[PDB]
Amino acid sequence: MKTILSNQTVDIPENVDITLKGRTVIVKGPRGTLRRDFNHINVELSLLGKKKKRLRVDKWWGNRKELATVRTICSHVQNMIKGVTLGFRYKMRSVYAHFPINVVIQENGSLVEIRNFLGEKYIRRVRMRPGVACSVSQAQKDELILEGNDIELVSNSAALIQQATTVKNKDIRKFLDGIYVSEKGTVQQAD
Amino acid sequence: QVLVLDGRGHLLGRLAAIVAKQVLLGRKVVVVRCEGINISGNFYRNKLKYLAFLRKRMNTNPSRGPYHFRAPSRIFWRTVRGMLPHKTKRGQAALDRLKVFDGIPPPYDKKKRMVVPAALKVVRLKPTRKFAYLGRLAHEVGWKYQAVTATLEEKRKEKAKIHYRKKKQLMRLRKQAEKNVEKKIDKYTEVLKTH
Amino acid sequence: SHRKFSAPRHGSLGFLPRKRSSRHRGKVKSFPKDDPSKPVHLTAFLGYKAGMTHIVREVDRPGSKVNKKEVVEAVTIVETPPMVVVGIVGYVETPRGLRTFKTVFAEHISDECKRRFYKNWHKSKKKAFTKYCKKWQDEDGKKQLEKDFSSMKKYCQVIRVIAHTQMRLLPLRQKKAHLMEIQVNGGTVAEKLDWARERLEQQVPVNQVFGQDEMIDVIGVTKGKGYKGVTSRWHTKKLPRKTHRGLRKVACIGAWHPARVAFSVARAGQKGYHHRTEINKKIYKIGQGYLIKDGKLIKNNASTDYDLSDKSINPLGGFVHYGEVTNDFVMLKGCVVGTKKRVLT
Amino acid sequence: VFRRFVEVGRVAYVSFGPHAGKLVAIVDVIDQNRALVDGPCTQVRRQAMPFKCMQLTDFILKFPHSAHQKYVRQAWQKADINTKWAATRWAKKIEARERKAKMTDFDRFKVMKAKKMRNRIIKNEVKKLQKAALLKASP
RNA sequence: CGAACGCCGGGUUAAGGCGCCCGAUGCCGACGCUCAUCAGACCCCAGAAAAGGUGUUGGUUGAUAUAGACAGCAGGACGGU
RNA sequence: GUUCAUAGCGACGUCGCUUUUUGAUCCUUCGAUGUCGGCUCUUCCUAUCAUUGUGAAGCAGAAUUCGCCAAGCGUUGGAUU
RNA sequence: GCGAAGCUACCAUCUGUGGGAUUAUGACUGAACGCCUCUAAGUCAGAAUCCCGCCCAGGCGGAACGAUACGGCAGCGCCGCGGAGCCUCGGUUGGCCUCGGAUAGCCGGUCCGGGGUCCGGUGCGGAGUGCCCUUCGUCCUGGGAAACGGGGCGCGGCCGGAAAGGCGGCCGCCCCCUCGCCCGUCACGCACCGCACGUUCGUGGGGAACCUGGCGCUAAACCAUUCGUAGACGACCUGCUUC
Ligand SMILES: [Mg+2]
Ligand SMILES: [Mg+2]
Ligand SMILES: [Mg+2]
Ligand SMILES: [Mg+2]
Ligand SMILES: [Mg+2]
Ligand SMILES: [Mg+2]
Ligand SMILES: [Mg+2]
Ligand SMILES: [Mg+2]
Ligand SMILES: [Mg+2]
Ligand SMILES: [Mg+2]
Ligand SMILES: [Mg+2]
Ligand SMILES: [Mg+2]
Ligand SMILES: [Mg+2]
Ligand SMILES: [Mg+2]
Ligand SMILES: [Mg+2]
Known part of the structure; x- marks a missing residue:
């Protein structure tokens, strides 16, 4: 109903350097650099504080619909800060029945190659996003590790695995089988 | 004379209602960069609508039917057809003044290119509304020269920057010639009547 | 309505405008895409459909019943004498397509090409290409002749090569050449242009471009039959014996209210002499012809790895309605588009 | 971004309409779309005005929210709004424009002689400047 | 729906309308509601309801919230039995 | 419908659509619009029978059934009239 | 009774081909609504669908190139001319260019295009403005600014522009100018006697006649006939050297 301004408080830790050149937020920290395009919303992002690094998100008029975005912007900034000081780690335990799933990762963590999936002789090769890596969890039964800096590209890479493994033309109440995401954690664990 | 209009971000209809009037009067208007002309509305509805135009053909012979053009310069030329009395020798001479070029020909590289402020996406839309590019639409439906335009348009944009950087050098020369004086005697008159 | 026995539709609505073509040397509507990796090579040729023979063939195809056995097949023979490269044409990628930038010919152009340009060679005074040689x-x-090549490197993006078949090494009556254009799919534009300048006025072999069991497509123009009726053109069904006004017609051309004959309604279009591009015909063999007198005259053709006999190219008594093969023949699989003595590509 | 806000105590230029070209001082916002303004100095009667009608400035004032005419005037006379405005360049840009609108025939003649001679002095001196530019920097 | 007619010049209007066809909004017009992957768009008039929407935007009749509730996070659920 | 109102059905009630049955009407044709069925051939509709991709079950697999984007391609051979 | 060539049979044989945006759907991230969410912005997977390839036909659509009329006068291109009468008319200074942003972009600027810095802003390093500009001609006539000259029958070189370029840029020489401008003394020029289409593009465009100089060009179609890879008739593919 054209409410006046609502704002959000984003406090920034000392690990990183943040920089906006418009509505293009550059966040540069210990686990590399990162930058995402907030250039499509009409929301003013400004920052303040000598070394104390306070970033305010601001929208003046808007709607119930338009004042909804001002927190999504606030929350997508959040996950970069988790994703640049720590990184994300996804633990994907491979659930299977009788038929054994054997997994290798093909070349340096890009391609993931799935063999003998449920008696599918079809080689099931799913490639990963630019900026993400894969691993097999050692001392651990058939659980998979994906790490990155951005929660889209990590979880897009996890999603491409768990939909390429789909039990088709049979009952899904039986055959509960495939690679599935378990825990959504950080690279530098529990910190 | 020669209304060399740009195509950066005009809306289709809002530009169309102004060109059709200004070409019935004799003023030759040449619309350049016709690929980047926006359409207000969804990205999916417009390729839903223009696809629905592609079904509109004649059963018994589709050769004698609605000639569906695909290039965005020709999409706009057929738009202006709807706004003229095209079946009369009042509009039939009118379309022969309107020339349209998707991308920029060599005569019209260098003549200055006007912009209608009344027909821009900047003005005419509440900015949260969505939008679609007629070049984006035309490559997706039939037209095959989006890549060939993209090569040639970078070829002039790279060629334009080396000139404006060289012309901005020239303008720095004359303001150093401003700062050298024996001209304020003439500038007494100039300042008292609109510097 | 609703025909009560629904059928698939007769004829091709894709091959519809069944016109006798305005050329019968079949042009190439779309060459393969050029590619920066692979070395400089041509993409097209000409031939003359000589005739057909069998081939008894050892078959190695694991997983079929045919394997390790011997098969008779229908096999054509296309005589392809060597091409002579004459010209070089440049093409600019524009927003209207490939604009022919300019052409550069060679100098001592053979008279079979000069016979291509005129209409009456006997009437004319042979005066084409005098001041171009100058x-x-x-x-x-x-x-300003090699400033062309500077521009041809610079602005021309696709270079296509003009070449003709020699006619003095054929049993054909016409003695006129067939000019072409052959796109070169080499790397950068410079080495496409320099390999072409390297080999103007040279007898480009057939075997240098093609290769055995490279599965290769044929563009040619079909047989000519003339203005034939419906049931022989479109293979629609004959009306029965009892029908007044005949048997070979179509009974219902349209409905009432679409008051117009549709362009799908089967009607007497002229059979044959159209243009076709048949795809995926495997070359078996390329065999040379008639070496000089060290061996005093070797024929030794159709002399494969299990026969070792003095056999000819042509059958005993020559190909019917062709003549006699004395050149490099490309021995293709299956029935090929065109009459005997038809120019192929 | 948004260096100037509409504000209790912001002087505001007026673009279109009855009260054009003069300054108001925004008292308070009525509702979203017009706001009660008052210029004692500019002789504008205390009244309402739409936000698109006006035109923001770069000065502010200190008077209370919903104040009377005398209490704006005391903010006005201390700040010297009338003198401090006219020596800004967007106040210059209005004044040099009204010269152009009020030219006469004789004054276009005196400009035209001074528009020629001033341009030609520069025109050869730019040639002389680029002579020394291209002669020295070609080594 | 205006409106009832000899031949015409000027003025003004009715019903109607003023993006472009097409005379007129080339007004710095007004306060708003609505986004449709089937929009919507003017008397007779030329395609549709019962039902439903945590799509919004209002409005009424209610209950709990500064003896801090609805949510989440944290915790407990023992005793004759 | 073992239990289970609604996976699949649904009484009593009620709101619509459709112009392939028919009925009702008589507006057009009486100086004629040649009015059954088959055969031959074309296009279109979707309210989908099979196919491509999916969703749901009282879907273990097997066979089925219930809906979805959907007309691109198919929907025969005969005895009787 | 067998039967060539020719036409033919699913009655012989061969060939029948991949990409892009997506629907239905399933999610990923995430508010609305502290938690939850496929959706509100953002994104991802996705098909006999749709669209283009590939394939057939090629427009009152366009390129590139070839050669272009002897014989006797003739005829033909350009290059520079003056003369000449006829038409189809429309115009009355030109503008030789940053990309792009909008909850923003502009300018000047040591250091390593960027960082830093600085001014501008309901845009004045402005397309509401900027430039050739109102200059009627010329003489007398003095002062500024001026030393580059400034036009051109000039000629010569060079590269710069191919997306529909023939348009532009530089010097060297080649005859003259220092009035190629501004302020100011000076006096004439038709001063056609109140009045209409005046002023330019423009030595426009097209056409056929003609003097005049300077250079070059000396053909090709169609029919006839022959062929018959083609044919209803046309159309088309072909032969036709004096060996
Ligand atoms: Mg099953
Ligand atoms: Mg069909
Ligand atoms: Mg083509
Ligand atoms: Mg025939
Ligand atoms: Mg009979
Ligand atoms: Mg009434
Ligand atoms: Mg009008
Ligand atoms: Mg509601
Ligand atoms: Mg009746
Ligand atoms: Mg009746
Ligand atoms: Mg009645
Ligand atoms: Mg017999
Ligand atoms: Mg036979
Ligand atoms: Mg969706
Ligand atoms: Mg097409």
Whole structure:
């Protein structure tokens, strides 16, 4: 109903350097650099504080619909800060029945190659996003590790695995089988 | 004379209602960069609508039917057809003044290119509304020269920057010639009547 | 309505405008895409459909019943004498397509090409390409002759090569050449252009471009039959014995209210002499012809790895309605588009 | 971004309409779309005005929210709004424009002689400047 | 729906309308509601309801919230039995 | 419908659509619009029978059934009239 | 009774081909609504669908190139001319260019295009403005600014522009100018006697006649006939050297 301004408080830790050149937020920290395009919303992002690094998100008029975005912007900034000081780690335990799933990762963590999936002789090769890596969890039964800096590209890479493994033309109440995401954690664990 | 209009971000209809009037009067208007002309509305509805135009053909012979053009310069030329009395020798001479070029020909590289402020996406839309590019639409439906335009348009944009950087050098020369004086005697008159 | 026995539709609505073509040397509507990796090579040829023979073939196809056995097949023979490269044409990628930038010919152009340009060779005074030969000769005319090649490197993106079949090594009556254009799919534009300049006025072999069991497509123009009726053209069904006004017609051309004959309604279009591109016909063999008198005259053709006999190219008594093969023949699989003595590509 | 806000105590230029070209001082916002303004100095009667009608400035004032005419005037006379405005360049840009609108025939003649001679002095001196530019910097 | 007619010049209007066809909004017009992957768009008039929407935007009749509730996070659920 | 109102059905009630049955009407044709069925051939509709991709079950697999984007391609051979 | 060539049979044989945006759907991230969410912005997977390839036909659509009329006068291109009468008319200074942003972009600027810095802003390093500009001609006539000259029958070189370029840029020489401008003394020029289409593009465009100089060009179609890879008739593919 054209409410006046609502704002959000984003406090920034000392690990990183943040920089906006418009509505293009550059966040540069210990686990590399990162930058995402907030250039499509009409929301003013400004920052303040000598070394104390306070970033305010601001929208003046808007709607119930338009004042909804001002927190999504606030929350997508959040996950970069988790994703640049720590990184994300996804633990994907491979659930299977009788038929054994054997997994290798093909070349340096890009391609993931799935063999003998449920008696599918079809080689099931799913490639990963630019900026993400894969691993097999050692001392651990058939659980998979994906790490990155951005929660889209990590979880897009996890999603491409768990939909390429789909039990088709049979009952899904039986055959509960495939690679599935378990825990959504950080690279530098529990910190 | 020669209304060399740009195509950066005009809306289709809002530009169309102004060109059709200004070409019935004799003023030759040449619309350049016709690929980047926006359409207000969804990205999916417009390729839903223009696809629905592609079904509109004649059963018994589709050769004698609605000639569906695909290039965005020709999409706009057929738009202006709807706004003229095209079946009369009042509009039939009118379309022969309107020339349209998707991308920029060599005569019209260098003549200055006007912009209608009344027909821009900047003005005419509440900015949260969505939008679609007629070049984006035309490559997706039939037209095959989006890549060939993209090569040639970078070829002039790279060629334009080396000139404006060289012309901005020239303008720095004359303001150093401003700062050298024996001209304020003439500038007494100039300042008292609109510097 | 609702025919009560629904059928698939007769004829091709894709091959619809069944016109006798305005050329019968079949042009190439779309060459393969050029590619920066692979070395400089041509993409097209000409031939003359000589005739057909069998081939008894050892078959190695694991997983079929045919394997390790011997098969008779229907096999054509296309005589392909060597092409002579004459010209070089440049093409600019524009927003209207490939604009022919300019052409550069060679100098001592053979008279079979000069017979291509005129209509009456006997009437004419042979005066085509006299003052163009002078452009090579004049040494201050050279500078704007090879300024072409500077532009041809620079702005031309696709280079296509003009070449013709020799006619003095054929049993054909016509003695006129067939000019072409052959796109070169080499790397950068410079080495496409320099390999072409390297080999103007040279007898480009057939075997240098093609290769055995490279599965290769044929563009040619079909047989000519003339204005034939419906049931022989479109293979629609004959009306029965009892029908007044005949048997070979179509009974219902349209409905009432679409008051117009549709362009799908089967009607007497002229059979044959159209243009076709048949795809995926495997070359078996390329065999040379008639070496000089060290061996005093070797024929030794159709002399494969299990026969070792003095056999000819042509059958005993020659190919019917062709003549006699004395050139490099490309021995193709299956029935090929065109009559005997038809120019193929 | 948004260096100037509409504000209790912001002087505001007026673009279109009855009260054009003069300054108001925004008292308070009525509702979203017009706001009660008052210029004692500019002789504008205390009244309402739409936000698109006006035109923001770069000065502010200190008077209370919903104040009377005398209490704006005391903010006005201390700040010297009338003198401090006219020596800004967007106040210059209005004044040099009204010269152009009020030219006469004789004054276009005196400009035209001074528009020629001033341009030609520069025109050869730019040639002389680029002579020394291209002669020295070609080594 | 205006409106009832000899031949015409000027003025003004009715019903109607003023993006472009097409005379007129080339007004710095007004306060708003609505986004459709089937929009919507003017008397007779030329395609549709019962039902439903945590799509919004209002409005009424209610209950709990500064003896801090609805949510989440944290915790407990023992005793004759 | 073992239990289970609604996976699949649904009484009593009620709101619509459709112009392939028919009925009702008589507006057009009486100086004629040649009015059954088959055969031959074309296009279109979707309210989908099979196919491509999916969703749901009282879907273990097997066979089925219930809906979805959907007309691109198919929907025969005969005895009787 | 067998039967060539020719036409033919699913009655012989061969060939029948991949990409892009997506629907239905399933999610990923995430508010609305502290938690939850496929959706509100953002994104991802996705098909006999749709669209283009590939394939057939090629427009009152366009390129590139070839050669272009002897014989006797003739005829033909350009290059520079003056003369000449006829038409189809429309115009009355030109503008030789940053990309792009909008909850923003502009300018000047040591250091390593960027960082830093600085001014501008309901845009004045402005397309509401900027430039050739109102200059009627010329003489007398003095002062500024001026030393580059400034036009051109000039000629010569060079590269710069191919997306529909023939348009532009530089010097060297080549005859003259220092009035190629501004302020100011000076006096004439038709001063056609109140009045209409005046002023330019423009030595426009097209056409056929003609003097005049300077250079070059000396053909090709169609029919006839022959062929018959083609044919209803046309159309088309072909032969036709004096060996
Ligand atoms: Mg099953
Ligand atoms: Mg069909
Ligand atoms: Mg093509
Ligand atoms: Mg025939
Ligand atoms: Mg009979
Ligand atoms: Mg009434
Ligand atoms: Mg009008
Ligand atoms: Mg509601
Ligand atoms: Mg009746
Ligand atoms: Mg009746
Ligand atoms: Mg009645
Ligand atoms: Mg017999
Ligand atoms: Mg036979
Ligand atoms: Mg969706
Ligand atoms: Mg097409």
